[model samples]
Target: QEKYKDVLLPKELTQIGDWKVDKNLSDDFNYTTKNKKFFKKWKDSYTNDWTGPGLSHFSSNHSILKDGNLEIKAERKPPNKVYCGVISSRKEVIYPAYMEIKMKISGLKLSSNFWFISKDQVLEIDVNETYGNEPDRSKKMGTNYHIFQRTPFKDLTPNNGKHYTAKGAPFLKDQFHRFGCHWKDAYHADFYLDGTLVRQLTIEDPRTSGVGFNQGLLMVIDTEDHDWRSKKGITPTDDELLDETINTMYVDWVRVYKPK
Candidate 1:
């Protein structure tokens, strides 16, 4: 009984930070380079900052504490060069938890992503991704998980990943809106929009997609530029297609928790 008992993670915990934000875009949230984990994890990034496609790269310069909130700003680069932004938690927080944030993304050919990922393990629990120039730009954002290893030319594969439209509320793109996900147990998780449950993920592929829901994962909030998915392999250089001098996603706050 003890083996299966602990398998369903406790809704209560004896140890763990509730991770409630103590302040807004202030120094209180981190230790800069002094704190070992956040610094190291933030520095260790995929694709060495993943700048090639978007023509923009990720920079700590964009992770600015400003305007009374944390703005992970993406910069407009010279000619074809574009730059992005990222800020991630160093903790591989166990699931049966709620992760949420209130943010806004604007600019050209960019999408702000909120998700949990452990790359080497091939797990991605996607909450939401809102690209500035999506065909349905005003009505919905993409949401889902791609848990298994990506096939070669993964983006071209039919089931490269599966997602749904997180239907937009009237205030969604106009301002900061809430997006989150709840990992209920090893077999299930739910995605939410503005306090509403929008989609549920039922883990079924035990040999492939199973690890994502049950295992601990790192929380990530990033602004990326790629011509895939929402991007249509386009560029901001085209006014009729994608035109902007700068792009950014602003974050009011992000927090993770289990419960009392």
Candidate 2:
């Protein structure tokens, strides 16, 4: 079949009989914290409001080892305005692929979110979105998962038809766990936590094809801004404190793969 013929697995992958590090994959395609100067040069242009201490503020500041793993480390900062890190395939690869990441969350105060996105499309497989810091607000703090499709400019508004949140599972405070998503096709995606299926999406859903997937996909990780965090009314402090404490998403690695 065409899918079998166009498999993108590297030689090392075939030998390992599983996904293996494709050394030939350009070094130009990994993560770095060299600062925004290098990131701007790499993308050839700047589009987002990506400014912070080094490149660590965004998700792209993490490292990718020779073993095919990509790690993302969050910065220690106050909550009102969290960081948003994004990595696109413009100069590296393209979509219609599968990607996953292993992460450990720390100092998870107020609403924090980490996920992958394409141009306008976003899939928020939140590890933990601790809404507020109220002792009685256990419902707000825990491992929550969401699947969102369509572009952030359109589909991701406060109330859009392209979003769905699973019941909060368990508390994952100051803990490490593996959270991943598989993009099987343009119209299908699946989410997994610790090897268990958490959610899925299909073409009929707004998140799959409603936003249009013509552009190359971009992966993003971000914490919510203070204004949004306070709306939940779950935290004890006001907007300012909620924003600063909710500043981190620690990742072990991120890997993307194509058909092969």
Candidate 3:
């Protein structure tokens, strides 16, 4: 079998074992317009009906596909409203899978995030949630998963995750880099940045066992205003959002793979 076929994966994933591309969950974004009308592998809206985080507005109009890239734009609308973009995979990303995204964060305060959530909305895996304008946070990569305890029963704590920082030139918005994660199983996961393993979670870890990763997940890519960040004084200024060079998230491509 061909090593890579038509898909792309980090070299780290290719060396570990044999894998096959999951076409339904991947896209190169080589299109001439926006997603809803042209892209079939992904939906132009959030996975669920939720519009966006906090005051940020999510609209297909802000999601653009052009010049071989997917751009999630963030800008202020009339009367102090912010508009952003989002895209969710049409198919759920199953376990025992590896997913990678080639993307860059927006230099504005908006978050450029790649994440996954279970169909039931109980489990969430955040591959990378990054902010570029914040000097301290822009150099750190936030990675973790959250398992919301439905009322009446609780299996584990709500937030189980960690943050990682690279050695140098660490700002996520400086350039496009590959952010990846491997769901080895329900109780184990590994995360990578630019092909280097940065963190690992195993069954032995307190937060790994009994997790709900068995449920298939819908992958998401988006840029938005998070109120929590606003509280921390990282809110994007109108001037920043209006700046074209730093207010958009750029996704060059995305790929997913499963064992052969």
Candidate 4:
């Protein structure tokens, strides 16, 4: 409902990315100022569970807004009681835009995702799920563009509920880093980190399942835990409950720009 007409995008964006110019949205979309209240923009709507082992749940208690940043955490209570969280935009967004999120996460066998949903609510895209502490993470975090048709088999082919994961990801465990997604248009998408493009996706490719990711979508951050990803002998403990706040995941900010 609101718009930015007289503002200019920061040098950080235009200095390197050739996003075309709808700099209006980038003027001050979300997380533009420190100590700004963002709850008025994104609400408590969320998603929970991914057929995993942890009996983790989602609730508003796990989300904290500070200095204009959105931090969603996954934590434990006691006796192996763990909780996760998700927060979505109050309104929907369309394509031809660039989105950058500053975030960091912790814990093995867990994930924090920057996700979007189609107008039909049927199509979903995981711009990136920064997973941590997994036995095989190898300290690498990759982006996956899925054709959310719901997988019914072990096949990893496109158009059949497969996740077209891109290679070349940086280790995201050390601290906060800029993770970005550029929805160049309906047929083209790219991933970025610290202003550098990480991976690209073209729906026209057979591996994309000929999907329509151009529809209006909503944005959200959802953190989850799948203990199954851990070693057989590993599991959550009281140390997790006592230190859930420190061990939890964090998201500093999320911004979307008009198509370049």
Candidate 4 residue 171 C-alpha distance from true site, Å:
4.5
lDDT of 3 by residue, 124-179 (tens): 78899887886888777778777765585463544565777766857878888778
Tens digits of per-residue lDDT, candidate 1, 1-260, equal 01111222222222433433212211222333325533654442432344434465666666755554556665556565556667766557566677767677665556677777774545667777766655565345567666554564342212433444444444245676667777777667777676666676776544533443566677777776665633555655434223333355666656665555
Kindly list the per-residue Cα lDDT of model 4 for residues 1-260, writing each as its tens digit: 22332333445456646554333222232364322344556665563333223556666777765544556666664445467677777566677677766677665355667778764445566676755654346244456555444455322324422222223444465566666777766677777766666566765423345545656777867676555543454444556545654466666556677633
Q: Compared with the true structure, what per-residue lDDT tens digits does model 2 show for residues 120-150?
A: 3344333334332333332332333233434
What's the true lDDT of residue 134 in model 4?
A: 49
Superposed by TM-score, candidate 1 places the C-alpha of residue 99 at a distance from the truth, in angstroms, of 0.4
Where's the lowest-lDDT run of ten residues in candidate 1? 1-10
- Best-first order by TM-score: 3, 1, 4, 2
Please identify model 3 stretches exceeding 4 Å from their true place.
1-12, 35-38, 150-159, 203-211
Best by TM-score: 3
| Superior by lDDT: candidate 1 or candidate 4 | 4
How are the candidates ranked when ordered by lDDT, highest leading?
A: 3, 4, 1, 2
Better of 3 and 4 by TM-score: 3
The regions of model 4 sitting more than 4 angstroms off are: 1-37, 47-54, 77-81, 135-138, 150-171, 204-211, 227-235, 244-246
lDDT score of model 1?
A: 0.56
Q: Model 2, 70: alpha-carbon shift in Å?
A: 8.9
